[PDB]
């Protein structure tokens, strides 16, 4: 019961923060004593940067171990293939996952931010929703901003990119806000960071609790 | 000062050295190949330079040092220079993405995907100088 | 070889009054796969409908849909499913029962996207159905007082809210002909806790 | 005609028979137990009936034939009858979950989850009659 998953960089880290990373997550349902050992390699044969390892015991007796490798901004965008080798002790052969930039057509996202009306027995709080659609590839970064500062990632919840009736993708983001927040400044921004978004890989729409 | 000195395996033309690579390589792997050779992917800036390249260009297609950082939308040579001279083939530059640049057998330029594998690539470096007599 | 046992649709249960439970087994050789049904009480089960489908990737998908009792389901009966195969070494057993715990009627909010350049003859209608418990909900869209086909829309899986409830988001792309006919689209949510008659609904308009 | 005849294992009271079942059972499994015994879960309609049931009630708690079709909000006895007599414990019927009815040791009624397992349940059936002399 050993599955491995290899993630691409987030568009926020790649284009804005300019410091992309890739994570290799290995979910182990029978934790036997020893070491899992996540090794990294590039398809070119060039050397890899130092990765950060983290092992976590879950609330159901399963070991979750991740290795985060920092990649090159220009190396990722230009098409380098990064690989991950997982040498598990309860497996005769090695687990190998690879990650590279999704090469194909582009479509910039369409941002739409909405605010829910006052529901009986919910005066001091409102829900702000956002529909980010018709984009390709599926890799997108959804952020919420208030007072020109980025709200913590835990405050909101974005859905996984699903396909539209056409060729693009879509995500929905939910953000519950307090009365104190909208009374301070009644303007909340939904930021989408995406490969195709022109200019500077960012699209944004502002919303108001009661315009 | 006369600039025409090149290292072994490199062909001269004006003030630059040229290496005509062979082997199946992606655009970025073609980029890494030139860095190992203490050069960089070819940057075409004159119709005289292109005329020379076309004569030594592989019929299959060659990778050239032109692409974009995405956070641009405009093509920029590996050395950092902008596009002054252009030998784009009819209907190019496209947007069937919305890319990396490759040179045809004819010498003409066309957009290609970053992951496409070509059997050739052209490298370039500044030619060294002979001091005056 | 994986198996999944679904609870009845709150629409089939509370509105249609004819609930069913589906056992799905994703896999092949001699597919003499047996899907057996049983109740925890030991009482007899109604006749189930079997359907086997070959997928676009050489995988066999076999389902068995068992019709259950309206009062038997709501009162707390446990329905089980046994999956046996000649390649599989040990029987697969899945069980289903009514999620017994607190209730909270959903809050329905339907929105309409404004006109985007190069998208004149079409608009997207979105719906946020939140703060409900249990997670079992039915999301429907209506036009001309009639229910639009299920394929026309896409509802997200119920995710947990910052509090104790759940939430779903539904997307429905509409044509100019539809809103020009009647510019009123209803978003219906069918839920155990929705009072009265287990239904909550909100209408939306492309350009009020 | 005098109605006081009961089948074996059943205790009499007025015009009805009562079976004081024992064993760990859910509300619906207790319901099925009575149907197999050609009866139905107990339907309390008088303070005299409750007084009798309390005397023979299990201290742990017993299942009674009271619940709601969800599309109710209103509790209804298994025979179809509505609630006239009520012996609700303080703070009952709840809206804690916002359910099924169980009888305490004291005889008092309280809401419980449908999937909760209790060691007792009370059944009832119409008592048979002795023909006149």
Swiss-Prot record, chains B, D:
UniProt signal peptide: none
Residue numbers binding Ca(2+): 92, 94, 110-111
Shown segment, full-protein numbering: 158 to 292 of 321
The protein, known as: Low affinity immunoglobulin epsilon Fc receptor soluble form
Domain C-type lectin: 5-125
Bridged cysteine pairs (disulfide): 3-129, 6-17, 34-123, 100-114
Curated annotation (Swiss-Prot), chain C:
Domain Ig-like residue range list: 1-100, 106-205
Residues that carry a glycan: 34, 46, 57
Disulfide cross-links: 23-81, 127-187
Subunit record text: The basic structural unit of both sIgE and mIgE molecules consists of two identical heavy chains and two identical light chains; disulfide-linked. N-terminal variable regions of the heavy and light chains form the antigen binding sites, whereas the C-terminal constant regions of the heavy chains interact with immune receptors to mediate effector functions.
Function: Constant region of immunoglobulin heavy chains. Immunoglobulins, also known as antibodies, are membrane-bound or secreted glycoproteins produced by B lymphocytes. In the recognition phase of humoral immunity, the membrane-bound immunoglobulins serve as receptors which, upon binding of a specific antigen, trigger the clonal expansion and differentiation of B lymphocytes into immunoglobulins-secreting plasma cells. Secreted immunoglobulins mediate the effector phase of humoral immunity, which results in the elimination of bound antigens.
The name this protein goes by in its record: Immunoglobulin heavy constant epsilon
């Amino acid at each position: 019961g050993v599955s491995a998953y290899l993630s691409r960089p987030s568009p926020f880290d790649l284009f804005i923060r300019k410091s992309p990373t890739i994570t290799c997550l290995v979910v182990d349902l029978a934790p036997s004593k020893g070491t899992v050992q996540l090794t990294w390699s590039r398809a070119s044969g060039k050397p890899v940067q130092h990765s950060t390892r983290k092992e976590e015991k879950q609330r159901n007796g399963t070991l979750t171990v991740t290795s985060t490798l920092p990649v090159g901004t220009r190396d990722w965008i230009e098409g380098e293939t990064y690989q991950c080798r997982v040498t598990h002790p309860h497996l005769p052969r090695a687990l190998m996952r690879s990650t590279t930039k999704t090469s194909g057509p582009r479509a910039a996202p369409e941002v739409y931010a909405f605010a829910t009306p006052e529901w009986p027995g919910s005066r001091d709080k409102r829900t702000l929703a956002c529909l980010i659609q018709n984009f390709m590839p599926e890799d997108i970064s959804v952020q919420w901003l208030h007072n020109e500062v980025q709200l913590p990632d835990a405050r909101h919840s974005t859905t996984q990119p699903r396909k539209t009736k056409g060729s693009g993708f879509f995500v929905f983001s939910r953000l519950e806000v307090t009365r104190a927040e909208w009374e301070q400044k009644d303007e909340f921004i939904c930021r989408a960071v995406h490969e195709a978004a022109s200019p500077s890989q960012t699209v944004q729409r502002a919303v108001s609790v009661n315009p | 000062f006369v600039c025409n000195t090149c290292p072994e395996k490199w062909i001269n033309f004006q003030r630059k050295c040229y290496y005509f690579g062979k082997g199946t390589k992606q655009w970025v792997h073609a980029r890494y190949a030139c860095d190992d050779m203490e050069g960089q992917l070819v940057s075409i800036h004159s119709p005289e330079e292109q005329d020379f390249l076309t004569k030594h260009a592989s019929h299959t297609g060659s990778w050239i040092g032109l692409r974009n950082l995405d956070l641009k939308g405009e093509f920029i040579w590996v050395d950092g220079s902008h596009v002054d001279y252009s030998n784009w083939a009819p209907g190019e530059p496209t947007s069937r993405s919305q890319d990396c640049v490759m040179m045809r057998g004819s010498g003409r330029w066309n957009d290609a995907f970053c992951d496409r594998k070509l059997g050739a690539w052209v490298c370039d470096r500044l030619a060294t100088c002979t001091p005056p007599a």
